[PDB]
Amino acid sequence: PMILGYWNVRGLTHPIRLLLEYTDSSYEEKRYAMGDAPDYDRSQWLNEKFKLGLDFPNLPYLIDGSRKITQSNAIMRYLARKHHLCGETEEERIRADIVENQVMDNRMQLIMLCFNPDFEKQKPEFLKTIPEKMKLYSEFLGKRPWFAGDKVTYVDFLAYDILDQYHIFEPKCLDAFPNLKDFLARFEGLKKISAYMKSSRYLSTPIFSKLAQWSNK
Amino acid sequence: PMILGYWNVRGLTHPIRLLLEYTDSSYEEKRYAMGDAPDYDRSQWLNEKFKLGLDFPNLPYLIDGSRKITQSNAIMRYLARKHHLCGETEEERIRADIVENQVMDNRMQLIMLCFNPDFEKQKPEFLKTIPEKMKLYSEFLGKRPWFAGDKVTYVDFLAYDILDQYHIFEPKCLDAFPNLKDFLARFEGLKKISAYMKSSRYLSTPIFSKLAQWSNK
Ligand SMILES: N[C@@H](CCC(=O)N[C@@H](CS[C@@H]1c2ccccc2-c2ccccc2[C@H]1O)C(=O)NCC(=O)O)C(=O)O
Ligand SMILES: N[C@@H](CCC(=O)N[C@@H](CS[C@@H]1c2ccccc2-c2ccccc2[C@H]1O)C(=O)NCC(=O)O)C(=O)O
């Protein structure tokens, strides 16, 4: 079995857990526990961070036999080439690449707001930016069934995850973009995805670590 | 020719600039200017931001004929594919994808301390962390000529820039890692790169905008 290591929170690893499930991968998990406030003890991880053979010790990590990978996109891409879920055309590939990075940016934005102590007074500002973000995803996907075109790629995994977290942080943000609502439902409707979602392993929340101002619980 | 869109700072776009040179690309640039303090006028870029046909408008952007791309790593992948500068084996691709995301992490960490109002007091703690950042690279590179292995790929462009910026920040941070230093001199030795560096095109400074407590002018 493959081993996925991460905190016991959604974090940035959902697309990975969903990809694992989607490709029917055999894997085990290491969900490292984080210490409560104000210490936020991380020795569950730290006791073995330098003891696992990884080039750049980090969470998440994927152990696949001899191969030891870190950096979530890096992990996503490995699984993707493994199950032919990479773009097939140059245009597929440009779309994917942009999407990949676009998701992480939109994700840091969220993070940066949810770990800042000034959350409360930062939120209304942040809120003003969301409709553009969504519009961008909505006009880019357009009428395509999947973000890269006609077939599911690893980028839909990342895409699903960050829009659902945004949807979750702002429930009515997809109201104006029904193609995005339909996308989440199509993704969600995938056989193995539906399935995992009802599983003992599903882990939707908390979205962040106990250090966050939002979805820390 | 092609067009590269970006502020008139080094920021995160050095790799693209060196890739375009190294590939003998026919490109022109649109270096936008940011007003000064306190205003910090962006109107020069904002007024055409949504009028370029980009899906997710950003800086940098690459216009190559019909193709419009955003997100520095996507741009880099794009040129990588165009000129065959990616890993050719699974192991090279993994190394490449891990390195690509690793650089930007280390990128972020540097920038999170230079666009930090408290730069100077947290500076002494970041410099403490630098020797283990550099050590990971050093150990990862090993005896190899290039980060992926046998030939040059786009991640070397990436690796070179962030190692060069850490180096500028901390001039002795490479003294214990001489192979990193040979990486840098060897990267500077590629003919088209050599030439470019001595050209009117080269922009090695400043790294950041105005609002930074490093590469501030
Ligand atoms: N560029 C890396 C991000 C890596 C990362 O920051 N790893 C964090 C976990 S995600 C982490 C996080 C924790 C809880 C909740 C949310 C997040 C998060 C989400 C997205 C992006 C960044 C953060 C992280 O910093 C960490 O714990 N590293 C191991 C260690 O330092 O020893 C990736 O894409 O894999
Ligand atoms: N993840 C995207 C980052 C995109 C980004 O934030 N672009 C910044 C410029 S880099 C930006 C920068 C600005 C000022 C000074 C320096 C830089 C910088 C330097 C290093 C690293 C990153 C940056 C960003 O903060 C921006 O100005 N976008 C246009 C806009 O939002 O409308 C990329 O990889 O392409």
Curated annotation (Swiss-Prot), chains A, B:
Keyword Lipid metabolism applies: yes
Which residue numbers delimit the GST C-terminal domain? Answer: 89-207
Where is the major localization of this protein? Answer: cytoplasm
- Indicate where the modification Phosphoserine is found in the sequence: 66, 204, 209
| Sequence ranges assigned to domain GST N-terminal in this UniProt record | 1-87
Q: Catalysed reaction per UniProt?
A: RX + glutathione = an S-substituted glutathione + a halide anion + H(+); prostaglandin A2 + glutathione = prostaglandin A2-S-(R)-glutathione; prostaglandin J2 + glutathione = prostaglandin J2-S-(R)-glutathione; prostaglandin J2 + glutathione = prostaglandin J2-S-(S)-glutathione
Residues reported to bind substrate? 115
The Gene Ontology biological process annotation of the record reads: cellular detoxification of nitrogen compound; cellular response to xenobiotic stimulus; glutathione derivative biosynthetic process; glutathione metabolic process; hepoxilin biosynthetic process; nitrobenzene metabolic process; prostaglandin metabolic process; response to amino acid
Among the entry's GO cellular component annotations, what is one? mitochondrion
Domain of life the protein comes from:
Eukaryota
Q: Give the keywords, sorted.
A: Cytoplasm, Lipid metabolism, Olfaction, Phosphoprotein, Sensory transduction, Transferase
Give GO terms: molecular function aspect only. enzyme binding; glutathione binding; glutathione transferase activity; identical protein binding; nickel cation binding; protein homodimerization activity; protein kinase binding; steroid binding
Subunit organization? Homodimer or heterodimer.
What is the designated name of this protein?
Glutathione S-transferase Mu 1
